[PDB]
Amino acid sequence: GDCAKEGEVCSWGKKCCDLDNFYCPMEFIPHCKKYKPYVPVTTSFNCAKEGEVCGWGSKCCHGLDCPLAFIPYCEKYR
């Protein structure tokens, strides 16, 4: 009682009947499904795309650049 069935949508007042199994993930439409699948193999080498963080030897792709601050982010050179 007072809970969203399995797969059903969950809200602030309506929490998944099974929290240990299902949860309310942050996304467009929060569902009551099991935790996400295992993490996929590490990504391949590539330049830092827009939004990516710089500092760990990561250079923004052609046309993009990173600002000078604590935690900058690649962005189209203005």
UniProtKB/Swiss-Prot annotation:
Compartments (UniProt record): Secreted
Species in which this protein is naturally found: Cyriopagopus schmidti (Chinese bird spider)
Family designation: Belongs to the neurotoxin 23 family. Double-knot toxin subfamily.
GO MF, any single term: toxin activity
Region (2 X approximate repeats with cysteine pattern C-C-CC-C-C) location: 3-74
Domain remarks in the Swiss-Prot or TrEMBL record: The presence of 'disulfide through disulfide knots' structurally defines this protein as a knottin. This toxin contains 2 'disulfide through disulfide knots' that are separated by a short linker. Bivalence accounts for irreversible toxin action.
Site label Important residue for activation of TRPV1, positions: 26, 68
CC terms in the record's Gene Ontology section: extracellular region
Record function comment: Selectively activates the heat-activated TRPV1 channel. It binds to TRPV1 in an open state-dependent manner, trapping it there to produce irreversible currents. It binds to the outer edge of the external pore of TRPV1 in a counterclockwise configuration, using a limited protein-protein interface and inserting hydrophobic residues into the bilayer. It also partitions naturally into membranes, with the two lobes exhibiting opposing energetics for membrane partitioning (K1) and channel activation (K2).
Subunit structure: Interacts with TRPV1 (2 toxins (4 moieties) bind 1 channel (homotetramer)).
Keyword field: Disulfide bond, Ion channel impairing toxin, Knottin, Lipid-binding, Repeat, Secreted, Toxin
Domain repeat ranges per the UniProt record: 3-32, 43-74
Name the record gives this protein: Tau-theraphotoxin-Hs1a
Annotated site residues (Interacts with TRPV1 (reaches into the void formed by S4, S6 and pore-helix)) in this chain: 12, 28, 56, 70
Superkingdom of the organism of origin: Eukaryota
Tissue specificity note: Expressed by the venom gland.
Disulphide bonds in the chain: 3-17, 10-24, 16-32, 47-61, 54-66, 60-74
Signal among keywords: no
